[PDB]
């Protein structure tokens, strides 16, 4: 593996120190200069190179950036995608608030790559990864996604899959969007029936397997079944699960077992 410094790392470090200096020095976003907003748009927001180049050519200040209309963002930055514009709007508004570092300059701890590579698969929804990432959906955007964007751009036509997202997001809210806390709580509930609200889809499959229903567990892959759904959706019952596990009605013992274990899971690991 190639070691040491280089042209790319020098360029990145210098871009970063524009960003770090404005932030640490208490410069409000409106007073940021051109190169600083350009660095910010690349490194902290995570926009592709062509938006960044558009910004560099057409947006000379944070004040300008802050006061762009929707139609002006589309014209000056070239952003066609409504969800990419959402991303920018929320980013600007967050930056304005924080500049008036504790704010993590290790940006992207819950950016669209975390949503895509880590979080959506944990909800049993990995088939939506490409659509969410192409719309650059970060954690900050999740609670702002409206029903039209979910249906159309994000291809979530299935109502159960949308319910699954909803309770995934409710879990994030209850955890105050603390990624470390979510990870810790999943690690500390691996081997006991506890804190079901935080369980991944994989963990749920592990639980089904542990019951002696191992040949059915794999059927929850891409099903949208995860712990926050089991804990927060009062309508989701053992028979809904049995169907998603594709347990035959002829396998009556398996269905009775699931009924009893599911009751135990809810009683011991939730507040339902």
């Amino acid at each position: 593996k190639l070691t040491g410094p280089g042209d790319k790392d020098r360029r990145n470090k210098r871009k970063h120190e524009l960003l770090e200096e404005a932030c640490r020095q208490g410069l409000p976003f409106a007073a940021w200069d051109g190169p600083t907003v350009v660095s910010w748009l690349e490194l902290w927001v995570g926009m592709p190179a062509w938006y960044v180049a558009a910004c560099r050519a057409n947006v000379k200040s944070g004040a300008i950036m802050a006061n762009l209309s929707d139609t002006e963002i589309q014209r000056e930055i070239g952003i066609s995608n409504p969800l990419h514009r959402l991303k920018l709007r929320l980013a600007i508004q967050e930056m304005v608030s924080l500049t008036s570092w504790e704010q993590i300059l290790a940006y992207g701890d819950m950016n669209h790559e975390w949503v895509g590579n880590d979080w959506l698969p944990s909800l049993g929804l990995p088939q939506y990864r490409s659509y969410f990432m192409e719309s650059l959906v970060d954690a900050r955007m999740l609670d702002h996604l409206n029903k039209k964007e979910l249906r159309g751009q994000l291809k979530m036509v299935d109502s159960f899959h949308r319910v699954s997202l909803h309770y995934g997001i409710m879990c994030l809210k209850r955890l105050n969007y603390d990624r470390k806390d979510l990870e810790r709580r999943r690690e500390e509930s691996q081997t006991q029936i506890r804190d079901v609200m935080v369980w991944s889809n994989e963990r749920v499959m592990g639980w089904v397997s542990g019951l002696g229903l191992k040949e059915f567990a794999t059927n929850l892959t891409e099903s949208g079944v995860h712990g926050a759904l089991l804990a927060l959706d009062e309508t989701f019952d053992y028979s809904d699960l049995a169907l998603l596990l594709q347990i035959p009605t002829q396998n009556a013992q398996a269905r009775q077992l699931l009924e009893k274990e599911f009751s135990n899971l809810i009683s011991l690991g939730t507040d339902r």
């Binding site: 190639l2 592709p48 490409s130 192409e134």
Partner: protein
């Protein structure tokens, strides 16, 4: 003969190739490129009379084992065929489709190819016309929406970058209303004769294309085309693989890389100039790291 070289020996290795020694008329580079020749599947679908007009050159056709197949259409023989081949990349299987610049007559096939195989990133390595000849038919709409059989292609935006143009399209399957965004990166800085004087622009372009695939989580193959889909396309794919392998493993083997590509589509990296440029650009990329300059 060992053609795998550690990074720190790459400068010296290239110098030795440029040189001619011990009683041969030709350089080490020329000898190495010719050694690729001695190095296979069959051309079946490509040679069907119903498909002959679908090939830009009669002598460049996909191998059967790696050809990109279209779903057959009722009653139309040859409708499963396009001159295009899958190639594996450094990290994933089917990372690329190598194909010719579309003809007017294969333009609808081209869009169906991107659709059926989930290709949403396209790389164009020529201008439409070069040296008084068509290299590529303009298969994309200019200002308004266009219909290519089942697909409605709507131009979304265009971005002019220093050494390439990015064109974004929305493509809809008119049969069921499903839609995807397709992005085309056209590299605009390849000279109409020879190879680029420096590899830096082409290296950055390779980087941008793969960054886009990663950032937008696009899993499908990158469709790469030039004139016939073997020369410049061969250079793009060779360097894509070699540059990443060099970064993570610290070694370069251009000879075996091209050999490997030619097991998947014939004639990849077609001229000695192109082959030499692979080495030249790898060395330039290496030089962007201080401990190896």
């Amino acid at each position: 003969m060992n053609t795998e070289v550690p990074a720190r020996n790459l400068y010296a290795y290239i110098q030795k190739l440029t040189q001619i020694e011990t009683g041969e008329n030709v350089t080490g580079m020329e000898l190495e490129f010719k050694r690729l020749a001695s190095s296979t599947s069959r051309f079946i679908s490509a040679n069907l009379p119903c498909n002959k007009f679908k090939n830009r050159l009669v002598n460049i056709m996909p191998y059967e084992s790696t050809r990109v197949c279209l779903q057959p259409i009722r009653g139309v023989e040859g409708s499963d065929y396009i001159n295009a081949s899958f190639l594996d990349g450094y990290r994933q299987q089917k990372a690329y489709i190598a194909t010719q610049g579309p003809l007017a007559e294969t333009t609808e096939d081209f869009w169906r190819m991107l659709w059926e195989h989930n290709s949403t990133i396209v790389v164009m390595l020529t201008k439409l016309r070069e040296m008084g000849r068509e290299k590529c038919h303009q298969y994309w709409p200019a200002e308004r929406s266009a219909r290519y059989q089942y697909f409605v292609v709507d131009p979304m935006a265009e971005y002019n970058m220093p050494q390439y143009i990015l064109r974004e399209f929305k493509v809809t399957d008119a049969r069921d209303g499903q839609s995807r965004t397709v992005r085309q990166f056209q590299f605009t800085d390849w000279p109409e004769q020879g190879v680029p004087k420096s590899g830096e622009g082409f290296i950055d372009f390779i980087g941008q294309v793969h960054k886009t695939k990663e950032q937008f989580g696009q899993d499908g193959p990158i469709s790469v085309h030039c004139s016939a889909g073997v020369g410049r396309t061969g250079v793009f794919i060779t360097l894509s693989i070699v540059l990443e392998r060099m970064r993570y493993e610290g070694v370069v083997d251009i000879f075996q890389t091209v050999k490997m590509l030619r097991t998947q589509r014939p004639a990849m990296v077609q001229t000695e100039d192109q082959y030499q440029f692979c080495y030249r650009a790898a060395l330039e990329y290496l030089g962007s790291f201080d401990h190896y300059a």
